[PDB]
Design goal:
Chains A, B: One of its GO terms (molecular function) is electron transfer activity. The structure is a homodimer. With about 130 residues, the first copy, chain A, is mostly beta strands. Helices cover about 10% and strands about 30% of the residues of chain A. Bound molecules: copper (II) ion (CU) (2 copies). The site of one copper (II) ion (CU) has 5 residues of chain A, from loops.
Chain lengths: ~130, ~130
């Protein structure tokens, strides 16, 4: 139907969705990230970052060096298709991006770039089929 | 009794012990850290760091800034009583420290300083008979 999806993140360092599908009828798509835990962002902040599967480790490594104030994502990172800000417990953030940045058939990776979270908080995104 | 203890770390970002007791008869205490998971040290490495409870956040912070080659511990950090190296799945490391560094009745914090791990990997250590 909709060109929107909600994904939850918690205090156990997990996302509640392992895969996300963007419908081909969509021109744009919005991701609503919710932090349903009760930990503060300095200890367990979460974001949602979308890249091609192969840019994962690099984006993460460099986001890590950008710091909390930069949402742990290097500014102007060309590898990042879209990202939310870092949020803490009881908060939410939304990000909308152009579906045309995506390529039918390709698997993209989405993950949390907060220090050390990428290993556990990761999933796959792609176009409908 | 004896002056040693074994603690396990896993791919779920947890330690298996929340408290450790050093017996008062000990002059030397040895901690054996085991990584029972299978993830690489760059993605889910673990260490064991001992500080006064107070110093947890600061040591964690500076440690993260020290980098993997420094085992995520600021070199010569004086707030650090003892620490292991950063290890990956299938490995183990041990550290032996002088009990005289601890003062009876005080609480000590032990935690993992690998980026972002300190929030879920923490325990208390105390001297007792
Ligand atoms: Cu996170
Ligand atoms: Cu760790």
């Amino acid at each position: 139907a909709q060109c929107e999806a909600t994904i939850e993140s918690n205090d156990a360092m997990q996302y509640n969705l392992k895969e996300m599908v963007v419908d081909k009828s969509c021109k744009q798509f919005t991701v609503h990230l919710k932090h349903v835990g009760k930990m503060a962002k300095v200890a367990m902040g979460h974001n949602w970052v979308l890249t091609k599967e192969a840019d994962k480790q690099g984006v993460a490594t460099d986001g890590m060096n950008a710091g909390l104030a930069q949402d742990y994502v290097k500014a102007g990172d060309t590898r990042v298709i879209a990202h939310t800000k870092v949020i803490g417990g009881g908060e939410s953030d939304s990000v909308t991006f152009d579906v045309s940045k995506l390529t039918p058939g390709e698997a993209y990776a989405y993950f949390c770039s907060f220090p050390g979270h990428w290993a556990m908080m990761k999933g796959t995104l792609k176009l409908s089929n």
